Structure formats: structure tokens, C-alpha cells
mmCIF file of C-alpha atoms and ligand atoms in Angstrom:
data_model
loop_
_atom_site.group_PDB
_atom_site.id
_atom_site.type_symbol
_atom_site.label_atom_id
_atom_site.label_comp_id
_atom_site.label_asym_id
_atom_site.label_seq_id
_atom_site.Cartn_x
_atom_site.Cartn_y
_atom_site.Cartn_z
ATOM 1 C CA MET A 10 15.268 -57.448 -126.054
ATOM 2 C CA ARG A 11 17.861 -59.811 -126.095
ATOM 3 C CA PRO A 12 21.910 -58.327 -124.771
ATOM 4 C CA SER A 13 24.054 -56.220 -126.651
ATOM 5 C CA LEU A 14 27.679 -57.704 -127.346
ATOM 6 C CA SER A 15 28.914 -54.590 -125.377
ATOM 7 C CA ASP A 16 26.912 -56.155 -122.590
ATOM 8 C CA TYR A 17 29.628 -59.429 -122.647
ATOM 9 C CA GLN A 18 33.261 -58.572 -122.161
ATOM 10 C CA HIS A 19 35.727 -59.940 -124.708
ATOM 11 C CA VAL A 20 38.659 -62.948 -123.494
ATOM 12 C CA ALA A 21 39.761 -64.104 -127.114
ATOM 13 C CA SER A 22 39.559 -63.955 -130.743
ATOM 14 C CA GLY A 23 40.873 -66.031 -132.939
ATOM 15 C CA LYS A 24 41.133 -65.602 -137.586
ATOM 16 C CA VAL A 25 37.653 -66.026 -137.923
ATOM 17 C CA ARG A 26 35.917 -66.614 -134.328
ATOM 18 C CA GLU A 27 35.534 -64.766 -130.767
ATOM 19 C CA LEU A 28 34.759 -65.467 -127.971
ATOM 20 C CA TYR A 29 33.652 -63.969 -124.869
ATOM 21 C CA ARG A 30 32.517 -63.887 -120.670
ATOM 22 C CA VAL A 31 28.325 -63.924 -119.897
ATOM 23 C CA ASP A 32 29.332 -65.358 -117.394
ATOM 24 C CA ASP A 33 31.315 -66.717 -114.662
ATOM 25 C CA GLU A 34 30.209 -70.374 -116.100
ATOM 26 C CA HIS A 35 28.940 -69.517 -119.439
ATOM 27 C CA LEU A 36 30.890 -67.746 -122.677
ATOM 28 C CA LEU A 37 29.448 -66.584 -126.664
ATOM 29 C CA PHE A 38 31.435 -69.404 -128.817
ATOM 30 C CA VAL A 39 30.988 -66.690 -132.129
ATOM 31 C CA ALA A 40 31.518 -67.082 -135.113
ATOM 32 C CA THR A 41 33.153 -64.795 -138.526
ATOM 33 C CA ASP A 42 31.951 -63.866 -141.794
ATOM 34 C CA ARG A 43 35.877 -63.627 -142.092
ATOM 35 C CA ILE A 44 37.341 -66.731 -144.414
ATOM 36 C CA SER A 45 41.675 -67.369 -144.713
ATOM 37 C CA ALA A 46 43.282 -67.979 -147.671
ATOM 38 C CA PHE A 47 47.173 -69.197 -147.608
ATOM 39 C CA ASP A 48 47.642 -68.109 -144.375
ATOM 40 C CA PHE A 49 46.238 -64.426 -145.042
ATOM 41 C CA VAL A 50 42.971 -63.647 -143.261
ATOM 42 C CA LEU A 51 40.883 -61.976 -146.225
ATOM 43 C CA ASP A 52 40.149 -58.481 -146.740
ATOM 44 C CA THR A 53 36.011 -59.550 -148.486
ATOM 45 C CA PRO A 54 34.278 -61.027 -145.386
ATOM 46 C CA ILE A 55 32.248 -63.978 -147.108
ATOM 47 C CA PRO A 56 28.149 -63.436 -146.597
ATOM 48 C CA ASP A 57 26.687 -65.924 -143.856
ATOM 49 C CA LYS A 58 29.575 -67.669 -143.721
ATOM 50 C CA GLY A 59 29.058 -67.297 -139.626
ATOM 51 C CA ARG A 60 25.601 -69.170 -139.284
ATOM 52 C CA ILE A 61 27.000 -71.400 -142.322
ATOM 53 C CA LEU A 62 29.126 -73.019 -139.870
ATOM 54 C CA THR A 63 27.197 -72.983 -136.821
ATOM 55 C CA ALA A 64 24.713 -74.710 -138.528
ATOM 56 C CA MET A 65 27.259 -76.907 -139.251
ATOM 57 C CA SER A 66 28.482 -76.941 -136.291
ATOM 58 C CA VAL A 67 25.566 -77.847 -134.204
ATOM 59 C CA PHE A 68 24.856 -80.850 -136.924
ATOM 60 C CA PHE A 69 27.768 -82.568 -136.013
ATOM 61 C CA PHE A 70 27.165 -81.792 -132.250
ATOM 62 C CA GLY A 71 24.384 -83.660 -132.131
ATOM 63 C CA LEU A 72 25.212 -86.321 -134.228
ATOM 64 C CA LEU A 73 28.025 -87.205 -131.994
ATOM 65 C CA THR A 74 26.765 -88.025 -129.012
ATOM 66 C CA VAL A 75 30.198 -87.788 -126.484
ATOM 67 C CA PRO A 76 30.391 -85.108 -124.092
ATOM 68 C CA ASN A 77 30.320 -81.343 -125.777
ATOM 69 C CA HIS A 78 30.334 -77.713 -124.104
ATOM 70 C CA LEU A 79 26.907 -76.751 -125.604
ATOM 71 C CA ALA A 80 24.598 -74.817 -123.090
ATOM 72 C CA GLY A 81 21.925 -73.782 -125.049
ATOM 73 C CA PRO A 82 19.696 -73.374 -127.822
ATOM 74 C CA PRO A 83 21.150 -71.851 -131.597
ATOM 75 C CA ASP A 84 17.744 -68.850 -130.843
ATOM 76 C CA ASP A 85 18.882 -68.843 -126.211
ATOM 77 C CA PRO A 86 18.042 -65.274 -124.753
ATOM 78 C CA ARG A 87 21.893 -64.870 -123.979
ATOM 79 C CA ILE A 88 22.939 -64.514 -127.466
ATOM 80 C CA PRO A 89 22.750 -60.864 -129.265
ATOM 81 C CA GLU A 90 21.042 -60.432 -132.290
ATOM 82 C CA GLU A 91 23.783 -58.803 -134.082
ATOM 83 C CA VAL A 92 25.482 -62.460 -134.204
ATOM 84 C CA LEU A 93 21.418 -64.837 -133.686
ATOM 85 C CA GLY A 94 22.735 -67.636 -136.283
ATOM 86 C CA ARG A 95 26.790 -67.245 -135.562
ATOM 87 C CA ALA A 96 26.453 -67.754 -132.011
ATOM 88 C CA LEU A 97 26.262 -70.091 -129.352
ATOM 89 C CA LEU A 98 26.393 -69.252 -125.930
ATOM 90 C CA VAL A 99 28.339 -72.258 -124.041
ATOM 91 C CA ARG A 100 29.908 -74.041 -120.870
ATOM 92 C CA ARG A 101 33.325 -73.118 -119.074
ATOM 93 C CA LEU A 102 35.641 -75.660 -119.113
ATOM 94 C CA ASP A 103 39.545 -76.074 -117.940
ATOM 95 C CA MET A 104 39.904 -76.397 -122.107
ATOM 96 C CA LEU A 105 43.095 -79.133 -122.642
ATOM 97 C CA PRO A 106 46.102 -77.799 -124.004
ATOM 98 C CA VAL A 107 46.521 -80.605 -127.277
ATOM 99 C CA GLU A 108 45.167 -79.499 -130.860
ATOM 100 C CA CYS A 109 42.889 -83.312 -130.944
ATOM 101 C CA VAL A 110 43.666 -84.200 -135.148
ATOM 102 C CA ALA A 111 43.340 -87.090 -136.390
ATOM 103 C CA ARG A 112 44.380 -87.924 -140.509
ATOM 104 C CA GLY A 113 41.983 -90.047 -142.664
ATOM 105 C CA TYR A 114 44.076 -89.183 -145.019
ATOM 106 C CA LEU A 115 47.921 -87.922 -146.370
ATOM 107 C CA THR A 116 48.161 -84.077 -146.775
ATOM 108 C CA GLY A 117 49.721 -81.045 -145.389
ATOM 109 C CA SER A 118 51.789 -81.026 -142.273
ATOM 110 C CA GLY A 119 51.514 -85.061 -141.771
ATOM 111 C CA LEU A 120 52.036 -85.767 -146.181
ATOM 112 C CA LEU A 121 55.171 -83.239 -145.185
ATOM 113 C CA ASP A 122 56.632 -85.179 -142.379
ATOM 114 C CA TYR A 123 55.653 -88.516 -143.451
ATOM 115 C CA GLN A 124 58.230 -87.430 -147.425
ATOM 116 C CA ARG A 125 60.667 -86.321 -144.109
ATOM 117 C CA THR A 126 60.979 -89.017 -142.086
ATOM 118 C CA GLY A 127 58.812 -91.800 -143.564
ATOM 119 C CA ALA A 128 56.763 -91.394 -139.617
ATOM 120 C CA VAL A 129 53.984 -88.628 -138.808
ATOM 121 C CA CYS A 130 53.780 -87.819 -134.500
ATOM 122 C CA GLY A 131 55.356 -91.232 -133.921
ATOM 123 C CA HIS A 132 53.645 -93.149 -136.345
ATOM 124 C CA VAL A 133 55.848 -94.949 -138.839
ATOM 125 C CA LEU A 134 54.027 -95.150 -141.890
ATOM 126 C CA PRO A 135 53.871 -97.489 -145.107
ATOM 127 C CA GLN A 136 56.623 -96.526 -147.634
ATOM 128 C CA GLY A 137 54.238 -95.633 -151.030
ATOM 129 C CA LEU A 138 52.277 -93.162 -149.354
ATOM 130 C CA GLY A 139 51.669 -89.831 -151.568
ATOM 131 C CA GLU A 140 49.102 -86.637 -151.687
ATOM 132 C CA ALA A 141 45.260 -87.950 -150.238
ATOM 133 C CA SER A 142 46.711 -91.446 -149.635
ATOM 134 C CA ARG A 143 44.451 -93.091 -147.732
ATOM 135 C CA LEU A 144 45.055 -94.098 -143.742
ATOM 136 C CA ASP A 145 43.179 -96.745 -142.416
ATOM 137 C CA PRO A 146 43.124 -96.819 -139.747
ATOM 138 C CA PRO A 147 42.816 -92.548 -139.433
ATOM 139 C CA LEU A 148 45.784 -91.208 -137.468
ATOM 140 C CA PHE A 149 45.823 -89.267 -133.858
ATOM 141 C CA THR A 150 48.040 -86.392 -135.165
ATOM 142 C CA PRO A 151 48.173 -84.490 -132.249
ATOM 143 C CA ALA A 152 49.952 -81.150 -132.316
ATOM 144 C CA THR A 153 50.583 -77.536 -130.111
ATOM 145 C CA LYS A 154 49.648 -73.494 -130.993
ATOM 146 C CA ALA A 155 52.964 -71.846 -131.057
ATOM 147 C CA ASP A 156 53.726 -68.389 -130.584
ATOM 148 C CA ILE A 157 51.170 -65.476 -133.045
ATOM 149 C CA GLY A 158 50.753 -66.018 -136.812
ATOM 150 C CA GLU A 159 52.717 -68.878 -137.003
ATOM 151 C CA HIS A 160 50.854 -72.968 -137.542
ATOM 152 C CA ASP A 161 50.907 -75.016 -134.715
ATOM 153 C CA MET A 162 53.553 -77.723 -134.053
ATOM 154 C CA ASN A 163 53.426 -81.793 -134.884
ATOM 155 C CA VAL A 164 53.640 -83.113 -132.004
ATOM 156 C CA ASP A 165 53.857 -87.406 -130.383
ATOM 157 C CA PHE A 166 52.324 -89.044 -128.096
ATOM 158 C CA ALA A 167 54.941 -88.256 -125.986
ATOM 159 C CA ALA A 168 54.483 -85.154 -125.863
ATOM 160 C CA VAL A 169 50.717 -85.110 -125.314
ATOM 161 C CA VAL A 170 51.387 -87.628 -122.261
ATOM 162 C CA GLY A 171 53.337 -84.844 -120.649
ATOM 163 C CA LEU A 172 51.103 -81.716 -121.557
ATOM 164 C CA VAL A 173 48.265 -84.111 -119.734
ATOM 165 C CA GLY A 174 49.396 -87.238 -118.201
ATOM 166 C CA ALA A 175 48.760 -91.058 -119.912
ATOM 167 C CA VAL A 176 45.369 -91.962 -118.718
ATOM 168 C CA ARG A 177 44.455 -88.499 -120.349
ATOM 169 C CA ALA A 178 46.479 -88.856 -123.755
ATOM 170 C CA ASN A 179 44.666 -92.031 -124.458
ATOM 171 C CA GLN A 180 41.974 -90.682 -123.835
ATOM 172 C CA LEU A 181 42.587 -88.421 -126.320
ATOM 173 C CA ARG A 182 43.544 -90.622 -129.317
ATOM 174 C CA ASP A 183 40.675 -92.948 -128.683
ATOM 175 C CA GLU A 184 37.883 -90.107 -128.623
ATOM 176 C CA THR A 185 39.476 -88.011 -131.617
ATOM 177 C CA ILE A 186 40.119 -91.590 -133.565
ATOM 178 C CA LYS A 187 35.662 -92.522 -132.513
ATOM 179 C CA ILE A 188 34.861 -89.299 -133.298
ATOM 180 C CA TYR A 189 35.921 -88.644 -136.244
ATOM 181 C CA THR A 190 35.177 -92.374 -137.429
ATOM 182 C CA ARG A 191 31.854 -91.638 -137.510
ATOM 183 C CA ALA A 192 31.565 -87.812 -139.176
ATOM 184 C CA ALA A 193 33.462 -89.084 -141.778
ATOM 185 C CA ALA A 194 31.479 -91.751 -142.781
ATOM 186 C CA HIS A 195 28.396 -89.879 -141.910
ATOM 187 C CA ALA A 196 29.844 -87.098 -144.701
ATOM 188 C CA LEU A 197 31.331 -89.633 -147.254
ATOM 189 C CA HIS A 198 27.552 -91.416 -147.167
ATOM 190 C CA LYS A 199 27.114 -87.341 -148.648
ATOM 191 C CA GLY A 200 29.406 -87.456 -151.183
ATOM 192 C CA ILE A 201 31.612 -85.415 -149.496
ATOM 193 C CA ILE A 202 35.243 -86.566 -147.422
ATOM 194 C CA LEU A 203 36.424 -84.676 -144.245
ATOM 195 C CA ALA A 204 40.038 -85.600 -145.063
ATOM 196 C CA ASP A 205 41.212 -84.263 -141.102
ATOM 197 C CA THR A 206 39.789 -83.151 -138.976
ATOM 198 C CA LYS A 207 41.043 -80.300 -135.221
ATOM 199 C CA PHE A 208 39.265 -80.434 -132.219
ATOM 200 C CA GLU A 209 39.390 -78.894 -128.771
ATOM 201 C CA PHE A 210 38.910 -80.979 -124.709
ATOM 202 C CA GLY A 211 37.852 -79.762 -122.233
ATOM 203 C CA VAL A 212 37.659 -80.739 -118.594
ATOM 204 C CA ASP A 213 34.155 -79.825 -116.480
ATOM 205 C CA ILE A 214 34.164 -80.237 -112.205
ATOM 206 C CA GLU A 215 34.115 -83.232 -112.207
ATOM 207 C CA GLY A 216 36.844 -83.868 -115.012
ATOM 208 C CA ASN A 217 34.902 -84.908 -117.378
ATOM 209 C CA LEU A 218 36.283 -84.690 -121.511
ATOM 210 C CA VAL A 219 34.526 -82.307 -123.446
ATOM 211 C CA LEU A 220 34.105 -81.524 -126.825
ATOM 212 C CA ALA A 221 34.979 -77.717 -126.290
ATOM 213 C CA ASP A 222 35.644 -76.481 -129.697
ATOM 214 C CA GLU A 223 33.710 -76.183 -132.808
ATOM 215 C CA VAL A 224 32.889 -79.222 -135.086
ATOM 216 C CA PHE A 225 33.370 -80.465 -138.767
ATOM 217 C CA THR A 226 33.581 -77.246 -140.213
ATOM 218 C CA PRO A 227 35.118 -76.427 -143.617
ATOM 219 C CA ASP A 228 37.455 -74.281 -141.238
ATOM 220 C CA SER A 229 37.882 -76.530 -138.479
ATOM 221 C CA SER A 230 38.528 -79.447 -141.552
ATOM 222 C CA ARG A 231 39.366 -80.703 -144.970
ATOM 223 C CA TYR A 232 36.431 -81.020 -146.793
ATOM 224 C CA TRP A 233 36.774 -83.080 -150.224
ATOM 225 C CA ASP A 234 34.066 -83.912 -152.890
ATOM 226 C CA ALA A 235 34.461 -87.526 -152.922
ATOM 227 C CA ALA A 236 33.079 -88.261 -156.569
ATOM 228 C CA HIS A 237 36.489 -86.137 -157.292
ATOM 229 C CA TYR A 238 38.723 -88.346 -154.776
ATOM 230 C CA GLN A 239 41.497 -89.051 -156.965
ATOM 231 C CA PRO A 240 44.629 -89.828 -155.069
ATOM 232 C CA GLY A 241 48.122 -88.768 -156.083
ATOM 233 C CA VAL A 242 46.831 -85.536 -156.361
ATOM 234 C CA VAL A 243 46.200 -82.483 -154.653
ATOM 235 C CA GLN A 244 42.467 -82.981 -154.271
ATOM 236 C CA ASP A 245 40.099 -78.826 -154.488
ATOM 237 C CA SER A 246 38.762 -77.281 -151.210
ATOM 238 C CA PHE A 247 35.177 -78.371 -151.395
ATOM 239 C CA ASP A 248 34.507 -74.548 -150.583
ATOM 240 C CA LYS A 249 37.778 -72.760 -150.538
ATOM 241 C CA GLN A 250 39.181 -73.749 -154.284
ATOM 242 C CA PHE A 251 37.014 -70.462 -155.805
ATOM 243 C CA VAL A 252 39.557 -67.772 -153.664
ATOM 244 C CA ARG A 253 41.842 -69.862 -154.025
ATOM 245 C CA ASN A 254 41.727 -70.319 -158.056
ATOM 246 C CA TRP A 255 41.290 -66.055 -157.927
ATOM 247 C CA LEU A 256 44.065 -64.938 -155.967
ATOM 248 C CA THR A 257 46.452 -67.041 -157.331
ATOM 249 C CA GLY A 258 45.352 -66.602 -160.772
ATOM 250 C CA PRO A 259 45.873 -63.806 -163.814
ATOM 251 C CA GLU A 260 43.451 -61.405 -162.361
ATOM 252 C CA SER A 261 44.720 -60.615 -159.072
ATOM 253 C CA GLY A 262 47.693 -58.836 -159.690
ATOM 254 C CA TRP A 263 49.313 -60.543 -156.879
ATOM 255 C CA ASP A 264 51.636 -63.218 -155.936
ATOM 256 C CA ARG A 265 51.286 -65.571 -153.685
ATOM 257 C CA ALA A 266 55.284 -65.878 -153.119
ATOM 258 C CA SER A 267 55.756 -62.196 -152.118
ATOM 259 C CA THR A 269 52.500 -60.624 -149.254
ATOM 260 C CA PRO A 270 48.755 -59.324 -147.250
ATOM 261 C CA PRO A 271 46.512 -60.387 -150.518
ATOM 262 C CA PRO A 272 44.454 -58.787 -152.655
ATOM 263 C CA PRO A 273 39.516 -58.159 -151.755
ATOM 264 C CA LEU A 274 37.922 -61.024 -153.344
ATOM 265 C CA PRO A 275 35.235 -59.866 -156.192
ATOM 266 C CA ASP A 276 32.545 -59.526 -154.950
ATOM 267 C CA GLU A 277 30.371 -62.699 -157.632
ATOM 268 C CA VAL A 278 33.882 -65.023 -155.813
ATOM 269 C CA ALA A 279 32.627 -64.118 -151.880
ATOM 270 C CA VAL A 280 29.037 -64.878 -153.587
ATOM 271 C CA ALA A 281 29.753 -67.666 -154.847
ATOM 272 C CA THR A 282 32.022 -69.508 -151.566
ATOM 273 C CA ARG A 283 28.667 -68.624 -150.182
ATOM 274 C CA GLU A 284 27.345 -70.994 -152.496
ATOM 275 C CA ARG A 285 29.454 -73.716 -152.220
ATOM 276 C CA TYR A 286 29.577 -73.970 -148.170
ATOM 277 C CA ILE A 287 25.804 -74.175 -148.632
ATOM 278 C CA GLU A 288 25.454 -76.730 -150.771
ATOM 279 C CA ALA A 289 27.994 -78.477 -148.006
ATOM 280 C CA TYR A 290 25.531 -77.790 -144.931
ATOM 281 C CA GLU A 291 22.516 -79.291 -146.349
ATOM 282 C CA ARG A 292 23.591 -82.197 -148.305
ATOM 283 C CA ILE A 293 25.630 -83.075 -145.235
ATOM 284 C CA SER A 294 22.782 -82.473 -142.701
ATOM 285 C CA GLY A 295 20.474 -82.547 -144.936
ATOM 286 C CA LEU A 296 17.636 -80.266 -143.418
ATOM 287 C CA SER A 297 17.822 -76.098 -145.387
ATOM 288 C CA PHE A 298 20.411 -73.725 -144.295
ATOM 289 C CA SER A 299 17.233 -71.555 -145.596
ATOM 290 C CA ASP A 300 15.380 -72.997 -141.964
ATOM 291 C CA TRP A 301 18.267 -71.752 -139.765
ATOM 292 C CA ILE A 302 17.937 -68.605 -137.812
ATOM 293 C CA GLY A 303 19.260 -65.447 -138.182
ATOM 294 C CA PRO A 304 18.905 -61.713 -137.862
HETATM 295 N N1 PZK B 1 35.493 -73.088 -126.781
HETATM 296 C C1 PZK B 1 35.693 -73.480 -125.989
HETATM 297 C C2 PZK B 1 36.307 -72.808 -124.201
HETATM 298 C C3 PZK B 1 35.410 -74.395 -123.072
HETATM 299 N N2 PZK B 1 34.325 -73.736 -123.420
HETATM 300 N N3 PZK B 1 35.471 -73.289 -122.118
HETATM 301 C C4 PZK B 1 36.982 -72.724 -121.382
HETATM 302 N N4 PZK B 1 37.210 -71.990 -123.340
HETATM 303 C C5 PZK B 1 37.225 -71.752 -124.583
HETATM 304 C C6 PZK B 1 38.553 -71.404 -124.562
HETATM 305 C C7 PZK B 1 39.129 -70.336 -124.781
HETATM 306 N N5 PZK B 1 39.622 -70.240 -126.297
HETATM 307 N N6 PZK B 1 39.222 -71.247 -126.522
HETATM 308 C C8 PZK B 1 39.435 -70.954 -128.439
HETATM 309 C C9 PZK B 1 38.701 -70.344 -129.418
HETATM 310 C C10 PZK B 1 38.169 -70.427 -129.361
HETATM 311 C C11 PZK B 1 36.830 -69.766 -130.048
HETATM 312 C C12 PZK B 1 36.859 -68.218 -130.398
HETATM 313 C C13 PZK B 1 38.624 -67.517 -130.244
HETATM 314 F F1 PZK B 1 38.537 -66.585 -130.091
HETATM 315 C C14 PZK B 1 38.884 -68.582 -129.306
HETATM 316 C C15 PZK B 1 38.233 -72.130 -126.746
#
């Protein structure tokens, strides 16, 4: 007899996730089956996507030695049946207002900042880099949230200091790079490049830094197939390239430059689910058929 989701108070919504209050010290972190492409939440859900990404996140939390916000098992009785397998019970933290990003490779807004200025978030880089260039060491490229529907804004280290304090800023930088390095090496051993990743942290009652997000999902991180890694061109999205190709192809009737995109073919949604499962099983060495559900 699990509680109903309606027993809990909705406190936040993101593009493809939701957050509920369970009691004064706990929340329910819910992944949905919604998928985003080209900054649009698409009309068509991906079956099992919320469960697969939750499974991925749980695997990576277990791999990392840093404190995290998980407060119970994936089958915790406080989790409603409706969201079983795609929701986790978590401890309430005081969240730090920094999107902590690590980049092991140069792409997206990092590449654009470099092409415009020669630097990214305060880091002056070597000349001659380009799309999907490897960065060593990985860069800490923090960002801040903007208005609803707007992209996060890249900021430099001084901005992080101004937001959270000098010592805490150093801690965020160091932990973000350490965590990314560990996860990226694990994934690469399994044939997947984690090109970059985005974390949020919070602080507990005792002042301790706690990892408090989904971690190393394909929504929070760029997944690439290592076997096809080719510096100098845009890498395929391991999980979303079918979706991107169909939307921008001749069958969609949609022009990306002009705006809400049409629904996806059922076949594209099913193929996409397969890509998520493939990524999960390769990285975790586990079978998704063993992951809990309703
Ligand atoms: N995680 C976490 C968390 C925590 N453990 N304690 C306090 N606050 C948060 C918290 C508040 N906003 N978010 C972002 C977010 C996440 C998931 C779904 C959403 F809609 C929005 C995270």
C-alpha cells in the first residue's frame, strides 16, 4: 500500500522532471518520460525513459564516493506506485545557486565562448582547438539559471565566489572535476564518452556539501559513442540523434528555424528507448529488465 502522488505537495517542475515535498526533511525526485530536443519539450514521450534515467543515476551515485541526497532505496515505501522506478526519496538540502559543469571536450556554449573570445568561464585555452576537441584537464565551466525558457548563463570563477564564498567556490570546482573525471573514465572503459556534465549541490545541516541532482544521465551529460569519436566534427548524440535527424529531416514537415515541433513517429520513440537501455546496460553492467517498475 504505497501512498498516492496526490498525497504530496508539488514544489517544482522542470522540462522533464518534477519535485514533491514528502515531509519537512524529504522530497520525492521524479523523472518523467518527456524528452527535449532543440530546447523544445516534445509532444511524444519516450517509453521507460524516466525509469532508465533513474536507474542510470542510481548506478552513478553508487560509483561515486561523495555524499549524495538519496534518502532511501528505489523501492522505498514512500514512493507511489505510479512513479515506481522513476522516483527517488531524497533529503532536503539548502541548494547552492550554481550549475556546476565539467567539460572534458569542447562543444556547445563552451566551444562558442572559445570561438568568440579564446576563453571559457575565465579559462584561457590553447589556440587551435575546435568542435569536440579533447580538453585536458577537464574544465570547470559554471553557469547560472536565467529566466524560464532561457539558457543558463556561463560565468567565471569570480562569479561563483560572489555567489557562495571563496572557500566553497574552490570546493565546488574541485569536487565537480573529481567526480566528472571518475565517471568519465568509467564510461570510456565501457565504450561511452561523457563529454561534459552538469551537477547541482546542496548543503546539509552540518555545513557539508552534498551532491543533489540527477547525475550523469543523458539529460545532464552529453553521451557520445567512443568508437566513433572524431575530433573536428559534431558528434552524434548517443541517445537523441534519431529524434534530431527525423525532426530536421524531410518527413517531419518542420523547419527548425521557424516553432513548436510536431509529434515523433512511434518507431523513433521505440528506437530511442532502445538507445537509452543500451547506454544504461553498457555503463552499469546491469540488466534494465531487473530495474523496478509499476
Ligand atoms: N534534488 C534536490 C533538492 C534537494 N535534495 N533539496 C532541496 N532542494 C532540491 C531541489 C530544488 N529544486 N531542484 C531542481 C529540481 C530537481 C528535480 C525536479 C525539479 F522539478 C527541479 C532541486
